[PDB]
Design a protein around this ligand. Structure first.
Ligand code: A1D79
Ligand code: ADP
Length: 473
């Protein structure tokens, strides 16, 4: 345990704040579809593979980092593990060749760590695979041949396919967080996995977060009230990212005299609500970036990367960094993947914006990025009656794109469901964004018979909005 102490200290160092350790709200977990974190690995004969289905922005990354902090502070798995390695998939190549040791040695504080004494005992090692989806580039069952040597340098996709199929440190423990969609690629790999669902806050712990954001007990009460009276923002705030998006927007209108109000009905109109809360001159550049980034599988941007797309004289430094960027290690990423997809979407709808027919030929593909929010938003945006920023929008070029989205929904509504995505519900979400009734009802035609997969009460809404638009008398 000479080095174990040094390693644990380093882990407390990196994982002590989300991006201190204070505003964390207990997210809801459900096994076999309420599990204590410690009890996860315990047998039903022990477990070597856990997977957290997590919706984007539900705090899967935070919940991970917390497990790291708690263990790194002796709170949980003191007895079960000697080492927890946090792998941020976002960062790791899938083409680069590397060894399990090379990948491991990066997790460590010092430069030449005792790697051979770490692997000594793998039954005491847990890898935290954070955002299996955030992996950039293709991934397919086809990949081979599978590796069996930790010291051997395969290219990332092989190496991980080998680690996940438990061929590399078989009796390692492994905890993968992932988006629901990316479960299709990953389901086959898993060695007898234990599935867990991150659900986000409850109604209670929805309250809890507001009074953890709002320093003043009154400013907190007045700004949770909005969200009971509003229906969308209540349903919509079981999700933590929204909660933040919402309360960072209730805080400069907490600055101004504007008696608090957000009458937002759609996800797009909440992003755009918050997007405006932080307000132009370099607007074109951001959207330029995100849409090369999504297309070219880059979630992390270097300074150099930035100077090309725009900010030729220190725009990012002041204008954007405040709330729309995060700096990692010298490299920069958007405060969330979604906001990237947004500007990537929003990039196709502006004053002189590329070809849209391209995007749709490959919707729901892993390697080009799922493009869930790429699509989903630019229905809620292209919407004619849906602002101020509405200006930067090209009024004329909008119903260029609006007229093909309907061609593509039509295709997808009544096929043999060749592709998995879009599952009907996603099209409903596309449709609840594109709030224009006439467009919705017309699309509703194309569905012969509908099919519901309702988990949460947000699902219930988006669905039950579209249902009545269906009727053809
Ligand atoms: C059905 C299918 C396949 O479209 C789907 C299922 S979850 C995903 S996702 O991985 O894209 N995650 C999200 O969309 N998360 C969401 C959802 C949401 C939508 C639908 C289901 C659920 Cl549970 C949630 Cl939280 C609603 C609002 C916001 C976010 C993040 C930004 C604000 C897609
Ligand atoms: N348990 C939590 N307590 C407080 N805020 C949270 C929590 N979970 C998520 N958040 C908020 O959501 C944001 C994004 O969460 P993150 O885990 O990065 O999402 P994902 O991993 O699904 O992309 C965080 O920056 C934080 O503001």
């Amino acid at each position: 345990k000479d080095y174990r102490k040094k390693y644990r200290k380093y882990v407390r160092s990196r994982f002590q704040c989300i991006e201190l350790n204070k505003r964390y709200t207990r997210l809801r977990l459900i096994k076999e579809h309420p599990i204590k974190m410690e009890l996860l690995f315990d047998p039903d004969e022990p477990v070597h593979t856990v997977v957290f289905q997590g919706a984007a922005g539900i705090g899967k990354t935070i919940l991970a980092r917390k497990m790291m902090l708690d263990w790194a502070s002796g709170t949980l798995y003191q007895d079960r593990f000697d080492y927890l390695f946090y792998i941020h998939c976002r960062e790791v190549s899938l083409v680069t060749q590397r060894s399990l040791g090379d990948l491991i040695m990066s997790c460590c504080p010092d430069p030449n760590p005792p790697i051979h004494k770490i692997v000594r005992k793998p039954s005491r090692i847990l890898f935290l695979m954070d955002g299996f989806d955030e992996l950039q580039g293709a991934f397919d069952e086809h990949i081979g041949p599978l590796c069996t040597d930790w010291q051997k340098a395969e290219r990332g996709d092989i190496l991980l396919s080998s680690l996940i199929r438990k061929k590399l440190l078989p009796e390692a423990s492994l905890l993968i967080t992932t988006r629901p969609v990316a479960l299709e690629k990953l389901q086959h790999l898993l060695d007898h996995p234990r599935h867990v669902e991150i659900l986000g806050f409850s109604e209670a712990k929805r309250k809890e977060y507001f009074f953890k954001y709002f320093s003043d007990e009154a400013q907190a009460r007045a700004a949770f009230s909005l969200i009971q009276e509003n229906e969308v923002l209540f349903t919509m705030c079981f999700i933590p990212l929204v909660c933040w998006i919402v309360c960072t927007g209730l805080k400069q209108q907490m600055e101004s005299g504007k008696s608090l109000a957000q009458t937002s009905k759609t996800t797009t109109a909440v992003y755009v609500f918050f997007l405006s809360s932080l307000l132009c001159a370099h607007l074109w550049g951001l959207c330029s970036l995100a849409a090369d980034g999504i297309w070219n599988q880059k979630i992390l941007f270097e300074e150099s990367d930035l100077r090309n797309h725009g900010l030729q004289k220190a725009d990012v430094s002041a204008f954007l960094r405040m709330n729309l960027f995060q700096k990692e290690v010298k490299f920069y990423s958007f405060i969330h993947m979604t906001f990237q997809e947004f500007f990537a979407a929003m990039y196709y709808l502006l004053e002189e914006s590329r070809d849209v027919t391209v995007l749709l030929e490959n919707y729901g593909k892993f390697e080009k990025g799922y493009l869930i929010f790429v699509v989903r938003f630019l229905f809620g945006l292209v919407n004619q009656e849906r602002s101020y920023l509405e200006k930067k929008l090209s009024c004329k070029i909008s119903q260029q794109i609006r007229l093909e989205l309907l061609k593509w929904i039509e295709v997808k509504a009544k096929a043999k469901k060749l592709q998995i995505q879009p599952s009907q519900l996603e099209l409903f979400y596309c449709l609840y964004e594109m709030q224009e009734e006439d467009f919705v009802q017309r699309a509703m035609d194309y569905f012969p018979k509908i099919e519901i997969n309702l988990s949460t009460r947000m699902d219930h809404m988006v669905s039950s909005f579209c249902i009545e638009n269906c009727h053809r008398v």
